[PDB]
Design a binder for these strands. Structure first.
Length: 1125
RNA sequence: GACCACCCCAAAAAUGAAGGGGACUAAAACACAAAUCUAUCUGAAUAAACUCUUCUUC
RNA sequence: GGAAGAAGAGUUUAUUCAGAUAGAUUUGUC
């Protein structure tokens, strides 16, 4: 296989004139340039040792011969065989003597090995190998030329259609219409029947079925016989070409040669005549045999030739294969009319759909869907915050609605923000709101509150409405516009409150204190630091910068290596020493990421000058002297290092930074810090400081208004953070959502914007990313005190074979006191999160019917094993030292390994138990569900787009067709009311009232069946509206069953559903096996934990532990099959 | 009957449709393969600091 | 509105192992 793109940054892009290979993002045509490159013969190609069979000594001999010839090639620049070298070669190698390849070529190959002679005439051996390459490269350059933009828009002065000009597409248009679909299918079947006959096919399948390595030539050899290659080539090929010259028409050609094989005459029509003559029903038939052939060859190419073991019978049996190729050419045809719709929207009348235009749609749409997770997981929390009792969606109704009724002219409707009071839930919602947002809500002063919830709602919607329903003109950058929301007082103040200069500084102050910086540094020395260095709440990855902790770890050893100019902290007390070291690591950690990186990556750079010191010492103890910039350089260093193998790359890069950082410290006057611990005199002064500072901090966080003491302010005043976020309205509303977000949806949201920024050189989202990095700091952590109730906890407990409803029984259950201390419940982070996002009633049900509960026997194991995890962790810690960084003589005795194995195994058990006990396993499940759900909406998104695609493609004329997808029903003449589904059915029913025989399946009797079962279209409503919650009328397995039915129009989509589900489980740590029946109803056969590979590079057996407990895997299984009742 | 895709282009001589391409289209946006590095968050452990709760004993 | 001993939870910080997302480079593609 020749890889002609993605090497050299070349890509094939399509342009109106022609299709060309392009480089970078320039439009210059580099086809000839790149191909001319590949017309070389790589000399190893000549020798190989694939199998187990060879003796090692011989096998080593040949492996050797491989690497040597891998850097020499043969080309013909101008009728002369010639040689080239890829790379430098060792000046001296003892070649010695060392029937290895096909015989003819040997003479020159040995001489080449020993350097002996040009023997240019003797390079003619390889002439025939090249003219074959040259013919491949040639046929290719044409396969590139003919792949070109072929979709065009005609205004028509009236009509405004889009159509394709590919020869392929000229045949789609003919059958573009629904009416012609049945003829298009027969023509296919004619063609399949002409080429392929049951006896011969029945016998191919035997051969494919009976496959022996490289007996595949048997199948190829057989296929050519079926296709009569020998007849066409031997008999008709030359006559056809020359005669092709003699006549203009296909018709005129046929008269000249009337005994032309059917396939060889379809192939002819396609290349020469299809493009340019009127198509008649007689003419079009010619095109089909070529189309069906390609589909089989494509099947053979994909299945027999390259790659599952006996499924092949499924697609290759005569009766199946026939249907397969029919559906296929239908699927290909249906996606062409959809493409006509799509381009009809985006193209001015002149235009053609070039690769530049096409490419940006996929990228834009795809990004936008990632943001589907954000709105969905945020809605669900907004549902949690106010304990609504709507089976139905609550989007868009936080506020009371007063209407003119059919009678009496005025009436007022429930405001979900207005049930808060009607239902006497003010207390529960107050505490619920506080958990997400830190503000002292007044649940009187209702207007303030109603105006606030209406912020979270409208915020989430501004997103949801854009992504869930295809929006033609939505662009990536604007998803977080939050266009019509105007923040309310409660939101304005809180965002001002949280992103406050003082509060932010008090967070760096708190860090500094807990690092023991305030108890081991004099006030004046600190102020010198603060006037000098800035703080960032999170670091960024400059590309090549090694981790500080890795760097710090290696300080003592290197100074022996290089004149470090440092002294480690040492002291009488070990306990102080660790404390002091943290202070040193925290202060230093701060300069590196920040002040130094700026200087070191800086043009006014230490880095080039230092870098040679590392180089020079290494020579004393060969890396490049090419100037440029540090990231490219170091990159270049990577390449040299890799190519040799013989680790040493990390040291150079580690060594550059350590000496770079120190000399930086000494040079720019931070050096005093070595003596941070040092003097007992001063420390006694500072002994009460860390304690006293901590006492305040709680005081200030609890109050947030406390007068600040003078001693603290001196410090607060000289801290510098770098730029504070400007207040933005958009930022404030973005802030409201971020807090609603779950912990994984934040991490995924963040990686999504960073992808957008990396992908296109736009820093847009720069502000929004800053906020996340601030909030992501403690979003999961338990910010404030919260309360859970035993009856809520109880739901997952087996007390004497019953759930616990009572604070009093909770005592009987908890002999060991993990849940209850006897007056208040224990408040683990895990509990904290379950309250926020727990959908405990549903969770309660699923667990209940999966036999998941927590038992006393399990509690008594957790406490027993809790007593010994310190050891097992200390064990793992030290042992990993031995593996990773080992002493001069140390070995991993197998006993070391068994000891390790046992430790990690004891830890997984404790962890697995601990997670169940603490309700983390339930939190994991909660999120897995919301992800599966919200991922599914994304599918509804395509379908809702594909529909209006094929519509405008099918019926450009119909003005009304767009009405179906516009939710602004004032604006619609027809299909005035409803949802996309309902408007389409009305459209569909009218579309064929007149029918050969009654078309309509959407009868009122039938539609009623559909709506209840969530079958056909109606599944899209179940999915997009999140109706699965909270009842689970239908199963996830069922949903998947008819979501796929719903996407059966596009193959690629229909069989991507289960990939997105298998892959979403792997993220969460489950490996799933499903079975899909002849009935096509999904079931789960197994669910099991993904594994962790420990000690990845030991000659010993793979050691691993499961990611999730079998009890949990058993609970994800039932979740999927969980139906109501 | 998916996980185990899909669409486009190559047929005289170059019947090797035994070939190539695709952020172009799905996989919720940058070919896979392999190996490093890093940012962020999360789980499990330990140490120091502060805060709150529970228990036992005179 | 009494002392003195056990405990636990939360938060901050340094460190060890692991995962998930995302970013950077290298190597190579019968």
């Amino acid at each position: 296989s020749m890889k002609v793109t993605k090497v050299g940054g070349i890509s094939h892009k399509k342009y109106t004139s022609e299709g060309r290979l392009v480089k970078s993002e320039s439009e210059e045509n580099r086809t000839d340039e790149r191909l001319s490159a590949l017309l070389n013969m790589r000399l190893d190609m000549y020798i190989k040792n694939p199998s187990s069979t060879e003796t090692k000594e011989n096998q080593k001999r040949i492996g050797k011969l491989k690497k040597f010839f891998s850097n020499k090639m043969v080309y013909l620049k101008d009728n002369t065989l010639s040689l080239k070298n890829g790379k430098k070669e060792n000046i001296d190698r003892e070649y010695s003597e060392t029937d290895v390849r096909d015989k003819k070529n040997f003479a020159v190959l040995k001489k080449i090995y020993l350097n002996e002679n040009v023997n240019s005439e003797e390079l003619e051996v390889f002439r025939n190998d090249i003219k074959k390459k040259l013919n491949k490269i040639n046929s290719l350059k044409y396969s590139f030329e003919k792949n070109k933009a072929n979709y065009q828009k005609i205004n028509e002065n009236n009509i405004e259609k889009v159509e394709g000009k590919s020869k392929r597409n000229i045949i789609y248009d003919y059958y573009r219409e629904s009416a012609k679909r049945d003829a298009y299918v027969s023509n296919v079947k004619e063609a399949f029947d002409k080429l392929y006959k049951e006896e011969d096919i029945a016998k191919l399948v035997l051969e494919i079925e009976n496959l022996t390595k490289l007996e595949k030539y048997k199948i190829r050899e057989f296929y050519h016989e079926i296709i009569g290659r020998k007849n066409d080539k031997e008999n008709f090929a030359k006559i056809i070409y020359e005669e092709i010259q003699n006549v203009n028409n296909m018709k005129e050609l046929i008269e000249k040669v009337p005994d032309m094989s059917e396939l060889k005459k379809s192939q002819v029509f396609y290349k020469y005549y299809l493009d340019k003559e009127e198509l008649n029903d007689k003419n079009i038939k010619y095109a089909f045999c070529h189309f069906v052939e390609i589909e089989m060859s494509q099947l053979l190419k994909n299945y027999v030739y390259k790659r599952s073991n006996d499924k092949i019978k499924r697609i290759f049996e005569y009766q199946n294969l026939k249907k397969l190729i029919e559906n296929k050419l239908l699927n290909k045809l249906d996606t062409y009319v959809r493409n006509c719709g799509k381009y009809n929207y985006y193209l001015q009348d002149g235009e053609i759909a070039t690769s530049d235009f096409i490419a940006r749609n996929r990228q834009n749409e795809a990004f936008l869907r990632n943001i589907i997770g954000v709105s969905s997981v945020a809605y669900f929390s907004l549902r949690n915050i106010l304990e609504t009792e709507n089976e139905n969606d609550i989007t868009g109704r936080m506020r009371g609605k007063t209407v003119k009724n059919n009678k009496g002219e005025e009436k007022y409707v429930s405001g979900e923000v207005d049930k808060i009071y009607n239902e006497n839930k003010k207390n529960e919602v107050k505490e619920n709101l506080k958990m997400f947002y830190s503000y002292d809500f007044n649940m009187d002063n209702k207007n303030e509150i109603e105006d606030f919830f209406a912020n979270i709602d409208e915020a989430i919607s501004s997103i949801r409405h854009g992504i869930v329903h295809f929006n033609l003109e939505l662009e990536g950058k604007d998803i977080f516009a939050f266009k019509n929301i105007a923040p309310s007082e409660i939101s304005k103040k809180m965002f001002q409150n949280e992103i406050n200069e003082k509060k932010l500084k008090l967070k760096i102050f708190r860090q500094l204190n807990s690092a023991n910086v305030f108890r081991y540094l004099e006030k004046y020395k600190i102020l010198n630091y603060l006037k000098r260095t800035r703080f960032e709440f999170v670091n960024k990855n400059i590309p090549f910068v090694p981790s500080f902790t890795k760097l710090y770890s290696r300080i003592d050893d290197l100074k022996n290596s290089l004149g470090i100019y440092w002294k480690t902290p040492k002291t009488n007390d070990d306990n102080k020493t660790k404390e002091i070291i943290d202070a040193q690591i925290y202060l230093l950690k701060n300069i590196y990421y920040g002040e130094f990186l700026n200087y070191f990556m800086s043009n006014n750079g230490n880095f080039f000058e230092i870098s040679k010191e590392i180089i020079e010492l290494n020579k004393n103890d060969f890396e490049d002297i090419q100037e440029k910039i540090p990231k490219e350089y170091l990159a270049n260093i990577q390449s040299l290092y890799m190519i040799n193998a013989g680790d040493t790359y990390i040291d150079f890069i580690q060594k550059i930074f350590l000496k770079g950082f120190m000399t930086y410290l000494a040079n720019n006057g931070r050096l005093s810090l070595i003596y941070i611990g040092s003097d007992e005199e001063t420390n006694t002064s500072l002994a009460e400081k860390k304690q006293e500072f901590d006492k305040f901090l709680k005081k200030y966080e609890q109050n947030n208004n406390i007068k600040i003491p003078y001693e603290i302010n001196e410090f607060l005043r000289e801290i510098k953070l770098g730029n504070i976020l400007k207040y933005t309205e958009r930022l404030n509303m973005f802030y409201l959502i971020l807090k609603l977000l779950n912990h994984k949806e934040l991490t995924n949201l963040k990686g999504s914007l960073e992808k957008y920024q990396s992908a296109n050189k736009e820093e847009a989202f720069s502000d929004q990313l800053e906020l996340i990095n601030l909030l992501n700091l403690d979003n999961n952590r338990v910010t404030e005190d919260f309360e859970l109730e035993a009856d809520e906890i109880g739901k997952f407990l087996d007390f004497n074979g019953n759930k616990v409803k009572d604070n009093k029984e909770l005592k009987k259950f908890d002999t060991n006191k993990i849940y209850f201390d006897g007056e208040n419940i224990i408040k683990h982070r895990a509990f904290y999160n379950i309250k926020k996002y727990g959908m405990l009633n549903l969770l309660e049900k699923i667990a209940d019917k999966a036999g998941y509960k927590i038992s006393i026997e399990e509690l008594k194991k957790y406490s027993n094993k809790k007593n010994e995890i310190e050891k097992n962790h200390k064990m793992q810690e030290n042992l990993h030292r031995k593996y990773a960084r080992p002493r001069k003589d140390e070995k991993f005795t197998d006993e070391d390994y068994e000891s390790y194995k046992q430790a990690i195994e004891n830890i997984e058990e404790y962890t697995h138990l601990k997670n169940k006990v603490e309700f983390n396993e339930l939190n994991l499940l909660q999120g897995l569900l919301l992800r599966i759900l919200h991922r599914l909406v994304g599918y509804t998104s395509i379908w809702e787009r594909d529909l209006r695609f094929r519509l405008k493609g099918e019926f450009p004329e119909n003005q009304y067709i767009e009405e179906i997808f516009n939710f602004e029903n004032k604006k619609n003449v027809k299909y005035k009311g409803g949802q996309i589904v309902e408007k389409y059915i009305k459209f569909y029913k009218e579309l064929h009232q007149n029918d050969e025989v009654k078309i309509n399946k959407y009868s009122s009797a039938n539609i009623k069946v559909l709506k209840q079962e969530k079958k056909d279209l109606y599944i899209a409503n179940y999915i997009a509206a999140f109706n699965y919650i909270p009842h689970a009328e239908i199963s996830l397995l069922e949903v998947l069953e008819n979501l796929r039915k719903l996407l059966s129009y596009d193959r690629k989509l229909k069989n991507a559903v289960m990939k997105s589900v298998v892959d979403i489980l792997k993220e969460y740590g489950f490996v799933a096996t499903f079975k899909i029946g002849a009935d096509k109803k999904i079931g789960i056969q197994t669910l099991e934990s993904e594994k962790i590979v420990h000690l990845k590079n030991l000659k010993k057996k793979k050691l691993m532990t499961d990611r999730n407990s079998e009890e949990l895997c058993k609970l994800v299984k039932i979740m999927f099959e969980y139906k109501m009742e």
